[PDB]
């Protein structure tokens with residue numbers, strides 16, 4: 001089946017310049033028998049290639065290209081079935097963009113290409129081409145954020161309690177500062193939140209969820225929360241199904257020696273979205289009392305900026321699924337960069353969660369994320385503050 | 395009940411400078427007896443004001459401020475319930491940011507306030523760092539523009555079980571119609587709801603799909619030329635038959651159109667209930683060469699979910715985000731972000747429901763270039779209606 005593949009990459013600036021002549025000649029000769037057409041753009045630091053051919057042929061080729069030592073940071077932008085070829089001839093065509101002025105490059109692209117009967121700008125491929133030509137250095141990974149330049153550098157269990165909590169740090173690696181801590185519920189045998197809640201009768205889960213937070217506040221009180229925020233997770237129903245859950249929480253945290261503003265409530269958008277009605281008065285009560293609110297797993301399930309017109313949380317936590325393989329996904333890159341900017345304009349704190357590799361950290365940092373939660377830095381620590389690991393140069 | 399209100403505004407650059415000393419002292423003296431406190435930041439071109447007090451009190455005051463001729467382009471950034479007063483003991487006070495070095499204004503603020511975990515503080519900081527970001531440029535001021543019409547020939551087409559009205563989608567910078575959207579009408583010219591109500595519930599999917607032959611027939615004999623035709627379809631109308639896509643192909647080709655000329659609008663709400671089923675339709679549409687738009691994007695609480703799982707050719711920004719965008723910092727921020735994301739993904743963005751020049755100007759300022767709305771072109775039954783264009787003064 002006819003398929004289109006588009007990707008972008010960068011050269012190693014410390015190595016000798018890539019022989020574009022050899023590249024394009026061998027590409028051209030290899031592509032024609034395989035029925036591969038397309039175009040390659042080069043701006044001095046970055047490549048941009050459009051490839052058209054069968055799914056199989058492009059799957060084989062792209063694997064070779066991904067492993068090629070002539071370039072790095074290969075980011076896939078589009079991969080789709082196609083009704084017709086935009087590019088004709090063949091060699092692989094190549095434009096050295098350093099030789100073109102303003103719109104000369106688009107003019108040469110339009111010489112031999114066909115984008116159907118409607119204006120070229122109605123074709124996604126052409127829009128991607130024009131964006132690379134206009135500002136291709138936008139998602140060029142900076143030199144200080146190359147992954148290879150970095151490397152990474154006690155408490156008891158409490159079985160007698162009905163539940164216990166693990167604390168995980170949210171960190172700002174750029175300042176080597178812990179930003180806040182999230183409390184994560186654990187069963188009396190050290191089990192996950194899913195096992196904890198399976199052990200509770202269905203009619204008691206909401207009440208358990210709210211009332212377990214007493215143990216989280218007690219822990220946070222016994223630890224030196226030195227002006228650090230504590231995040232807690234709650235089902236919206238746990239706050240809603242109570243005469244005064246907000247007031248209950250208030251008495252609990254103040255009794256533990258915390259302050260309202262020190263406590264942030266984390267709810268997932270999937271659970272928020274499905275009940276605006278009852279969340280508005282809960283959020284209102286939480287606001288007036290002085291507690292904060294985060295949207296957790298933003299990007300997972302149903303996730304929206306339109307959520308923000310109704311109300312604005314204090315913090316958004318970008319779900320691990322947008323973080324996962326962000327280094328190779330032009331889509332995830334664009335989406336996360338957009339969330340970051342929107343939150344800046346709205347005054348909403350943004351945290352990237354599930355950060356497991358330096359690659360993820362570097363690319364998230366390149367799109368404006370400064371706060372991070374993940375196993376790369378700190379794992380959850382049962383009834384205590386864990387060790388934090390910091391990235392350090394080389 | 396305590397509340398916080400934040401807005402940013404702009405000076406008139408061509409008028410004599412406002413005596414802010416007098417303004418602020420008068421403000422402070424009036425505010426404090428009413429239980430109102432806050433601060434005013436000024437950078438030479440823009441104001442940023444934080445107000446604190448009862449919902450009633452700030453409602454009343456902000457209404458006076460919105461109508462004050464000393465400024466314009468008043469955009470509200472925040473209005474929320476508050477637990478405590480951040481500016482206790484200050485009726486009003488001005489900080490001229492041009493009188494401080496970096497960090498200096500924020501350091502002063504924190505000496506009479508009563509921090510980066512607070513949203514008001516983050517918004518203050520953002521104004522001090524890059525307040526000019528959503529400053530409406532001078533050539534995009536609504537008073538610098540006027541609409542003028544570029545004759546409509548609608549017709550009744552008998553013998554058909556439905557009709558279609560056409561509304562243009564326009565690119566005003568190039569004074570160009572980008573595409574036409576086909577909007578279904580009853581045999582008597584009534585609304586889509588009126589059309590579908592006359593059809594039996596179990597046959598509505600089939601009718602929705604088969605009605606498109608009449609949209610294609612209309613576009614074909616116009617002639618459509620090099621323009622796109624947007625048609626609206628329920629995802630379920632596409633699943634109903636084995637070769638719904640194959641049928642659409644036949645019908646548009648018989649009407650003399652090309653696959654890449656036809657674009658299918660599905661509403662985000664209808665896609666996100668069923669990710670399954672749609673993948674197989676979408677595959678067939680792509681292989682056939684037809685294009686896809688997400689309609690009313692931002693009305694089902696929206697898309698970040700969707701874009702990883704596919705990317706449409708076009709997104710149409712919902713009319714709710716367009717409405718009052720000229721006074722909503724939140725809506726401006728959201729639309730600006732969608733525009734940037736789509737640009738990066740090579741997705742075409744259209745703003746829907748554009749009714750006023752105020753909306754068009756602000757939409758233009760956040761990067762939108764395609765527009766659909768009564769400001770430019772109203773739907774015309776079985777024909778191409780008249781189109782109005784903004785022209786500069």
Ligand SMILES: Nc1nc2c(ncn2[C@@H]2O[C@@H]3COP(=O)(O)O[C@H]4[C@@H](O)[C@H](n5cnc6c(=O)[nH]c(N)nc65)O[C@@H]4COP(=O)(O)O[C@H]3[C@H]2O)c(=O)[nH]1
Pocket residue numbers: 168183184185192193194209212233234235266296297353354355356373374375376380
């Ligand atoms: N793969 C990966 N995972 C990472 C990484 N960093 C952190 N995590 C984990 O992601 C979960 C915390 O985020 P969450 O979205 O609040 O997700 C939590 C939260 O929703 C929740 N939960 C925790 N405590 C409570 C609670 O007290 N009440 C309610 N209703 N839910 C809770 O159950 C969910 C799953 O929690 P956990 O098993 O504790 O697992 C934790 C955590 O250990 C990473 O780098 N990679």
Ligand SMILES: Nc1nc2c(ncn2[C@@H]2O[C@@H]3COP(=O)(O)O[C@H]4[C@@H](O)[C@H](n5cnc6c(=O)[nH]c(N)nc65)O[C@@H]4COP(=O)(O)O[C@H]3[C@H]2O)c(=O)[nH]1
Pocket residue numbers: 561576577578585586602605626627628659689690746747748749766767768769773
């Ligand atoms: N206030 C205001 N309204 C504006 C403005 N500009 C356009 N509109 C209107 O917004 C609707 C078109 O957008 P839609 O989201 O596709 O919304 C459409 C679409 O969902 C739909 N529809 C139309 N044709 C079909 C169809 O053939 N099949 C299906 N399933 N739905 C259809 O029914 C909806 C109602 O359509 P319409 O009555 O034709 O109303 C039209 C239109 O006249 C504006 O500036 N201000």
Ligand SMILES: Cc1cc2nc3c(=O)[nH]c(=O)nc-3n(C[C@H](O)[C@H](O)[C@H](O)COP(=O)(O)O)c2cc1C
Pocket residue numbers: 009023026027028030031040047049061064065066068070071092
């Ligand atoms: C930016 C870039 C674009 C490339 N494009 C192609 C191409 O389109 N066709 C191709 O066969 N190889 C292309 N390659 C080269 C492949 O990565 C790989 O070196 C080559 O296909 C191996 O073929 P060989 O067996 O002849 O050595 C490209 C490499 C880079 C750096």
Ligand SMILES: Cc1cc2nc3c(=O)[nH]c(=O)nc-3n(C[C@H](O)[C@H](O)[C@H](O)COP(=O)(O)O)c2cc1C
Pocket residue numbers: 403417420421422424425434441443455458459460462464465486
């Ligand atoms: C940037 C700006 C900020 C203002 N802030 C206040 C204020 O906080 N309190 C207030 O009473 N008026 C404020 N005003 C002035 C009002 O718009 C209005 O002129 C005044 O309150 C009318 O009441 P008065 O005639 O009793 O003074 C502000 C005006 C501008 C342009």
Ligand SMILES: [Mn+2]
Pocket residue numbers: 182233266296
């Ligand atoms: Mn959480």
Ligand SMILES: [Mn+2]
Pocket residue numbers: 296297317319353
């Ligand atoms: Mn989470």
Ligand SMILES: [Mn+2]
Pocket residue numbers: 575626659689
């Ligand atoms: Mn539509």
Ligand SMILES: [Mn+2]
Pocket residue numbers: 689690710746
């Ligand atoms: Mn719409």
